[PDB]
Design a binder for this molecule. Sequence first.
Ligand SMILES: CC(=O)N[C@H]1[C@H]([C@H](O)[C@H](O)CO)O[C@@](O[C@H]2[C@@H](O)[C@@H](CO)O[C@@H](O)[C@@H]2F)(C(=O)O)C[C@@H]1O
Ligand SMILES: [Cl-]
Length: 231
Amino acid sequence: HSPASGRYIQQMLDQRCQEIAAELCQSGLRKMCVPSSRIVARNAVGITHQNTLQWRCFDTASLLESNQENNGVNCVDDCGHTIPCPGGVHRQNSNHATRHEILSKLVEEGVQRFCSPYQASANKYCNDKFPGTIARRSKGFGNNVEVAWRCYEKASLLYSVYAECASNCGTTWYCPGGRRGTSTELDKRHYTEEEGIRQAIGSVDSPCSEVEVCLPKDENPPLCLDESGQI
Ligand SMILES: CC(=O)N[C@H]1[C@H]([C@H](O)[C@H](O)CO)O[C@@](O[C@H]2[C@@H](O)[C@@H](CO)O[C@@H](O)[C@@H]2F)(C(=O)O)C[C@@H]1O
Ligand SMILES: [Cl-]
């Protein structure tokens, strides 16, 4: 068991999308008659004139290997933030079903189960200061070694790259959505906030008593074990 996000919200969205595709197939929608391996949930633009980010059930066979670059697809972390995932929408040829309401509801429900209150606090600090940003302890511009707590514009993160985030005990954890420390323009889109983010994390009340040891888990609540006596 790794100290890492299980990406449980994304898993649930993919499974729900697999069920929806199967239901559309039964309704006669031929292009939705596929094995489950072909269907994922992504938050993205759609076909032409579908220009808002919405939760949609995509056939992966219709996705483009690259985006360029307003047509990227986004996956979701376990605190419900959308982050760039591999691939792009084909604006003419996409095979998808927009299901924004049900998929958004599943995200909201999942956040309660899976989002570390310590991470939620760090994310809130960042969004309050820099709207749209989330917290990670990760790389900056043109330095692929140094990590620091920063408020990152979500578009600058990579879902396939894990980066440090706060566990539900306020201890080291790793979450999808990280930086490579490359030197692209996107690599600039962050605001380093060591003091403010650490304070946000430090301000969270423990799920355990002062007489218990917090052992973090990939779901809330963490384990609170009775502290060992002067045995
Ligand atoms: C340009 C951008 O979107 N973000 C840059 C930010 C940003 O301008 C400031 O954080 C706004 O207050 O600055 C970065 O560089 C920082 C950083 O090196 C810190 C270390 O604490 O020291 C400051 O003097 C630098 F401006 C940042 O926050 O990382 C670079 C971002 O691209
Ligand atoms: Cl996560």
